[PDB]
Design an enzyme around this catalytic site. Structure first.
Site, PDB file in Angstrom:
ATOM      1  N   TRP A 174       0.891  -1.156   0.000  1.00 33.75           N
ATOM      2  CA  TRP A 174       0.000   0.000   0.000  1.00 33.75           C
ATOM      3  C   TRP A 174       0.940   1.219   0.000  1.00 33.75           C
ATOM      4  O   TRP A 174       1.887   1.215   0.790  1.00 33.75           O
ATOM      5  CB  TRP A 174      -0.839  -0.101   1.274  1.00 33.75           C
ATOM      6  CG  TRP A 174      -1.942   0.920   1.550  1.00 33.75           C
ATOM      7  CD1 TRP A 174      -2.955   1.210   0.662  1.00 33.75           C
ATOM      8  CD2 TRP A 174      -2.067   1.642   2.715  1.00 33.75           C
ATOM      9  NE1 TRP A 174      -3.711   2.113   1.262  1.00 33.75           N
ATOM     10  CE2 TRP A 174      -3.207   2.397   2.481  1.00 33.75           C
ATOM     11  CE3 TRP A 174      -1.378   1.775   3.901  1.00 33.75           C
ATOM     12  CZ2 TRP A 174      -3.674   3.267   3.431  1.00 33.75           C
ATOM     13  CZ3 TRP A 174      -1.849   2.651   4.843  1.00 33.75           C
ATOM     14  CH2 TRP A 174      -2.981   3.381   4.613  1.00 33.75           C
ATOM     15  N   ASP A 176      -0.506  -5.718   9.683  1.00 33.21           N
ATOM     16  CA  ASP A 176      -1.529  -4.878   9.086  1.00 33.21           C
ATOM     17  C   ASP A 176      -2.684  -5.796   8.660  1.00 33.21           C
ATOM     18  O   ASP A 176      -2.587  -6.620   7.725  1.00 33.21           O
ATOM     19  CB  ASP A 176      -0.948  -4.161   7.883  1.00 33.21           C
ATOM     20  CG  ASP A 176      -1.828  -3.050   7.352  1.00 33.21           C
ATOM     21  OD1 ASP A 176      -3.055  -3.155   7.378  1.00 33.21           O
ATOM     22  OD2 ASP A 176      -1.279  -2.059   6.891  1.00 33.21           O
ATOM     23  N   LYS A 214     -13.608  -1.796   5.954  1.00 34.48           N
ATOM     24  CA  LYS A 214     -13.930  -2.739   4.883  1.00 34.48           C
ATOM     25  C   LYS A 214     -15.065  -3.709   5.257  1.00 34.48           C
ATOM     26  O   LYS A 214     -16.155  -3.682   4.663  1.00 34.48           O
ATOM     27  CB  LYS A 214     -12.679  -3.566   4.566  1.00 34.48           C
ATOM     28  CG  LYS A 214     -11.805  -2.958   3.456  1.00 34.48           C
ATOM     29  CD  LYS A 214     -10.868  -1.828   3.930  1.00 34.48           C
ATOM     30  CE  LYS A 214     -10.624  -0.760   2.838  1.00 34.48           C
ATOM     31  NZ  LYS A 214      -9.410   0.048   3.053  1.00 34.48           N
TER      32      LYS A 214
HETATM   33  C1  MPL Z   1      -8.166  -0.148   2.691  1.00 34.52           C
HETATM   34  C2  MPL Z   1      -6.904  -0.194   3.556  1.00 34.52           C
HETATM   35  C3  MPL Z   1      -6.662   0.716   4.546  1.00 34.52           C
HETATM   36  C4  MPL Z   1      -7.597   1.796   4.846  1.00 34.52           C
HETATM   37  O1  MPL Z   1      -7.623   1.889   6.237  1.00 34.52           O
HETATM   38  P1  MPL Z   1      -8.616   2.825   6.955  1.00 34.52           P
HETATM   39  O2  MPL Z   1      -9.153   1.910   7.978  1.00 34.52           O
HETATM   40  O3  MPL Z   1      -7.696   3.866   7.509  1.00 34.52           O
HETATM   41  O4  MPL Z   1      -9.560   3.242   5.890  1.00 34.52           O
HETATM   42  C5  MPL Z   1      -5.516   0.644   5.291  1.00 34.52           C
HETATM   43  N1  MPL Z   1      -4.561  -0.270   5.035  1.00 34.52           N
HETATM   44  C6  MPL Z   1      -3.463  -0.261   5.848  1.00 34.52           C
HETATM   45  C7  MPL Z   1      -4.746  -1.189   4.009  1.00 34.52           C
HETATM   46  C8  MPL Z   1      -3.674  -2.208   3.677  1.00 34.52           C
HETATM   47  C9  MPL Z   1      -5.924  -1.147   3.249  1.00 34.52           C
HETATM   48  O5  MPL Z   1      -6.093  -2.023   2.173  1.00 34.52           O
END
Ligand code: MPL
Ligand code: MPL
Lengths: 396, 396
Positions: free
Chosen positions: B130, B211, B246
């Site tokens: 990322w 992560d 997500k």
């Molecule tokens: C979509 C995504 C995020 C976004 O995190 P938020 O919770 O701050 O929106 C963060 N990371 C670290 C990754 C890998 C990822 O796909």
């Protein structure tokens, strides 16, 4: 990796709720953190926000990511509150505002921006100030120097000593000013003192950083912004860190704003793209709920009308408790004229109690206050006022 | 102060929504940021969260400040999701978790903590990763070194080259691992590869930083955590930065978690008081709405039952679109066997398109993808699939 990490000391303000909620005594009174209480000793969620939250419930479609700088409606409504309906800064497109997680979040985004994109090293903060001011700027790498402010004898702003303190401040340094309801003293400059202060900042080349957490709590919304507006007219560049925690009673939803202003549109937009990059490297974009409640209210004539009446009810209730504290300290036998706290505004009273008196008050009487002698007047009710003043006169 | 501040470049992911929403073409397809879409091309707010928000509306009393570390119910529910119902870390009181503004916020709180309270200088991140990983750690003062990960020829994890890359990593360095649904490649280690990786971290003395943004999107909730749990059993100390953006579709409400684990209770509590101090010097305490929606659902059997069915519906819909993308690239005449993207999991497909092909796709065909060739499969519907595959075969 973690075997030698020694423990951080407790926070002087936030660490008090940990202690208070671990106290077993059936009469303990809080007075520490700056949260409003109504006549019943409850911190309610305002009616204007409860209705806005209803609206949001039935009218939101998505929780999809907001832009780095947050809701634009929010940003336009904030600038109008801060600078005035029909200000030159708004019409010359000189101001840019990002939505942050509260005024603390706005202060950190400001410190990061300045550390990475400017030549500043020193930030000047009043003696005394909110404790967490030191902590935020030092996190960015900036040093914090101190300027005189209060005269504890006469219980006034020592203006000649503030002027004098700030003559060691160089061109290019940041001077943090509180917009209204000075935390902790409660003493604000007069319009005349704010004008003197504005011409002197221009002359000496300081960058104003306004901390504006209490709009609406001194005299009113527009009056409380007179100091800022006196500066905004004299200045090409300034940054203001605003909060809606207090005046909207949205404490835990984290809604505030960091507004950047520069000489013209092209410059402020260039500068703001760096402030957006500093925000992305921290949290990515801001929390929507509290900020779209602020925006729903400020946009709707009816919901705004219910809100500034709820806010003038809060200010008026604190006003009555400040009088009631002074009257009841007299009939409880305090030999000290505590009449000076009536001239202080905002949520607090800076009583002049010593660290030991404050400490004896939690350990023997269970009333909790900050170790500087700062007490929360908005936490006082007619029901806890006599046990409270009884505890203070016994410690004097 | 701001005359020489040059403009920051646009964000590779977030900067795409700015461009897409400035495109006037009546057929443009988004595919950039990792946000789920349903069959109609809408990102809906889930039913389980809409019902939790109803509950909150009628049952909240105050918006009073949460503790620095957030809601404890949230913190207990998170640790059980991450480590397992009845894990040793939970029962030996070895884990402490703070509520943050999303996974980005959790990653920054982790970087600040480590920069101020530990001897680390280097963080090791995969090639590729990322984009914003570099940016967050560099904000704290930490350098970012790179480890090999993907073999673009065979479209696999080059495991022997990852092992080899990481032999230049010293004892005391941080190695960032993605828990599941590797961003951007979609290729995860097998349990066997995660076990090898765990014993090697112990042997060489690296601090694992996990992560974990996509729990539930590969095979399922508990399966997706196997890698982390293999490590947690071998390790005395580790930190995991989790997100609920997500899997709860709560993108703009900013809800995530930073969990710290150490050898024992006394040490982790000492360490956590410093992580609390780093949080206070940034935003002060976390946004309540999204996080108390997560907590209301995870606590209620019915609301949790509606949620993991909504999450398996999302994972299954992406699964069908990954097949449909491969089938339709074949009947549209792509001469390249794109069958490898079916083995990738999560929301994305790392198509192997060049930066110029990606750039030609927005400028001539209006489909927006990240400049690394990362495309969002969860943004694909049966209605935009043929214009989309037509655009890609014309650029090959
Ligand atoms: C979509 C995504 C995020 C976004 O995190 P938020 O919770 O701050 O929106 C963060 N990371 C670290 C990754 C890998 C990822 O796909
Ligand atoms: C109450 C208060 C705050 C708290 O700000 P949040 O918006 O982050 O809660 C911040 N400042 C800077 C001051 C002075 C203050 O009184």
């Amino acid at each position: 990796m973690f075997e030698n990490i020694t423990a951080a000391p407790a926070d002087p303000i936030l660490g008090l709720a940990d202690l208070f909620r671990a106290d077993e005594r059936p009469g303990k009174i809080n007075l520490g953190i700056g949260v409003y209480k109504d006549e019943t000793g409850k911190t309610p969620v305002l009616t204007s926000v409860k209705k806005a939250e209803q609206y949001l419930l039935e009218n939101e479609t998505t929780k999809n990511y907001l832009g780095i700088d947050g809701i634009p409606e929010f940003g336009r409504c904030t600038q109008e509150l801060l600078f005035g309906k029909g200000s030159a800064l708004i019409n010359d497109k000189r101001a840019r505002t990002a939505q942050t997680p509260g005024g603390t979040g706005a202060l950190r985004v400001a410190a990061d921006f300045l550390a990475k994109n400017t030549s500043v090293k020193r930030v000047w903060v009043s003696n005394p100030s909110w404790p967490n001011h030191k902590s935020v700027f030092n996190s960015a790498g900036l040093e914090v120097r101190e300027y005189a402010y209060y005269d504890a004898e006469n219980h006034t702003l020592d203006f000649d000593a503030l002027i004098n303190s700030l003559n060691e401040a160089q061109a290019g340094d940041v001077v943090l000013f509180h917009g209204c309801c000075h935390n902790p003293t409660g003493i604000d400059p007069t319009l005349e003192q704010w004008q003197t202060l504005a011409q002197l900042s221009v002359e000496k080349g300081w960058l104003p950083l306004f901390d504006f957490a209490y709009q609406g709590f001194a005299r009113g919304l527009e009056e409380d912004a007179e100091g800022l507006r006196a500066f905004a007219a004299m200045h090409k560049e300034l940054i203001v860190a605003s909060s809606y925690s207090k005046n909207f009673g949205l404490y835990n939803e984290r809604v505030g704003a960091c507004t950047l202003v520069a000489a013209d549109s092209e410059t402020v937009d260039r500068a703001f793209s760096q402030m957006k990059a500093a925000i992305r490297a921290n949290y990515s974009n801001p929390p929507a709920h509290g900020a779209s409640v602020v925006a729903t209210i400020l946009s709707n004539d009816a919901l705004r009308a219910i809100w500034e009446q709820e806010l003038t009810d809060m200010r008026q209730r604190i006003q009555r408790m400040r009088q009631l504290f002074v009257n009841t300290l007299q009939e409880k036998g305090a030999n000290r004229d505590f009449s000076f706290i009536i001239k202080q505004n905002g949520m607090f009273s800076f009583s002049g109690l010593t660290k030991e008196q404050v400490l004896r008050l939690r350990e023997e009487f269970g009333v909790y206050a900050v170790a500087s002698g700062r007490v929360n007047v908005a936490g006082m009710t007619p029901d806890n006022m006599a046990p409270l003043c009884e505890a203070i006169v016994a410690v004097l």
